[PDB]
Design a protein around this motif. Structure first.
Motif, mmCIF file in Angstrom:
data_model
loop_
_atom_site.group_PDB
_atom_site.id
_atom_site.type_symbol
_atom_site.label_atom_id
_atom_site.label_comp_id
_atom_site.label_asym_id
_atom_site.label_seq_id
_atom_site.Cartn_x
_atom_site.Cartn_y
_atom_site.Cartn_z
ATOM 1 N N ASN A 86 0.721 -1.288 0.108
ATOM 2 C CA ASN A 86 0.091 0.162 -0.070
ATOM 3 C C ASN A 86 0.896 1.254 0.034
ATOM 4 O OD1 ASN A 86 -2.451 -1.977 1.099
ATOM 5 N ND2 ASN A 86 -2.765 -0.368 -0.498
ATOM 6 N N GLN A 87 1.951 1.119 0.832
ATOM 7 C CA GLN A 87 2.800 2.347 0.769
ATOM 8 C C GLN A 87 3.868 2.496 -0.463
ATOM 9 O OE1 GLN A 87 0.665 3.378 3.487
ATOM 10 N NE2 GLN A 87 2.319 4.742 3.339
ATOM 11 N N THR A 88 4.345 1.559 -0.956
ATOM 12 C CA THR A 88 5.380 1.565 -2.070
ATOM 13 C C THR A 88 4.866 0.568 -3.135
ATOM 14 O OG1 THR A 88 6.487 -0.009 -0.941
ATOM 15 C CG2 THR A 88 7.315 2.278 -0.824
ATOM 16 N N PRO A 89 3.679 1.036 -3.795
ATOM 17 C CA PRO A 89 3.076 0.080 -4.612
ATOM 18 C C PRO A 89 3.735 -0.250 -5.991
ATOM 19 C CG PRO A 89 1.815 1.982 -4.684
ATOM 20 C CD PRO A 89 3.087 2.263 -3.530
ATOM 21 N N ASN A 90 4.764 0.654 -6.473
ATOM 22 C CA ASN A 90 5.298 0.456 -7.740
ATOM 23 C C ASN A 90 6.384 -0.586 -7.446
ATOM 24 O OD1 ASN A 90 3.591 1.937 -9.385
ATOM 25 N ND2 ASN A 90 4.548 3.787 -8.921
ATOM 26 N N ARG A 91 7.262 -0.305 -6.423
ATOM 27 C CA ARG A 91 8.467 -1.263 -5.945
ATOM 28 C C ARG A 91 7.964 -2.655 -5.432
ATOM 29 N NH1 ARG A 91 12.926 -0.178 -2.231
ATOM 30 N NH2 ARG A 91 14.217 -1.977 -1.896
ATOM 31 N N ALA A 92 6.831 -2.490 -4.732
ATOM 32 C CA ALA A 92 6.178 -3.938 -4.292
ATOM 33 C C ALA A 92 5.751 -4.663 -5.654
ATOM 34 C CB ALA A 92 5.200 -3.678 -3.395
ATOM 35 N N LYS A 93 5.107 -4.247 -6.613
ATOM 36 C CA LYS A 93 4.528 -4.740 -7.773
ATOM 37 C C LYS A 93 5.884 -5.457 -8.392
ATOM 38 C CE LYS A 93 0.471 -2.106 -8.550
ATOM 39 N NZ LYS A 93 0.353 -0.629 -8.838
#
Ligand SMILES: [Cl-]
Ligand SMILES: [Cl-]
Length: 162
Positions: free
Chosen positions: A140-147
């Protein structure tokens, strides 16, 4: 692609103290300095880390050196961790990079807390683990990196980084 190049894309490089996504004082390639609000407590940690009076600024070589230590510490923490080690041992080379990435970002403690996802990874249930990993403050916080990390786990390739 390798772990170093992967993390370099994810964290960037800054040669002056900066604040991370959570508001903490950081420098170089995602090297957390302190969680304290004080810029001075940050400069102090910085100078302790480098072995010289830095006045909040470092050179490339110094940043890369911190980065080498940090990756090494990340790997070694996984290997010493009773919850993490079995997961890491079971994975292929690409997926191992994805776990190292999470640990570098969130620490051994944090990752070790993803109990359910860890079990799914160990069982090689890719799609299910990707779904579970997404239900996290992290995503939720760092969605692009998490994805990107999540895709690495699902696929087992470096696609998200190319
Ligand atoms: Cl250090
Ligand atoms: Cl992000």
């Amino acid at each position: 692609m390798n772990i170093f190049e992967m993390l370099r894309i994810d964290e960037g490089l800054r040669l002056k103290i900066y604040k991370d996504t959570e508001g903490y004082y950081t420098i170089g390639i995602g090297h957390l300095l302190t969680k304290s609000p004080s810029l001075n407590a940050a400069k102090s940690e910085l100078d302790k880390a480098i072995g010289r009076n830095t006045n909040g600024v470092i050179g490339k070589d110094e940043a890369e050196k911190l980065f080498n230590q940090d990756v090494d510490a990340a790997v070694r923490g996984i290997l010493r961790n009773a919850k993490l080690k079995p997961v890491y041992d079971s994975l292929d080379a690409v997926r191992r990079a994805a776990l190292i990435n999470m640990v570098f970002q969130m620490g051994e403690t944090g990752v070790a807390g993803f109990t359910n996802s860890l079990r799914m990874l160990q069982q090689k249930r890719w799609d299910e683990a990707a779904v579970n990993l997404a239900k996290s403050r992290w995503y939720n916080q760092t969605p692009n990196r998490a994805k990107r990390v999540i895709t690495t786990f699902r696929t087992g390739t470096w696609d998200a980084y190319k």
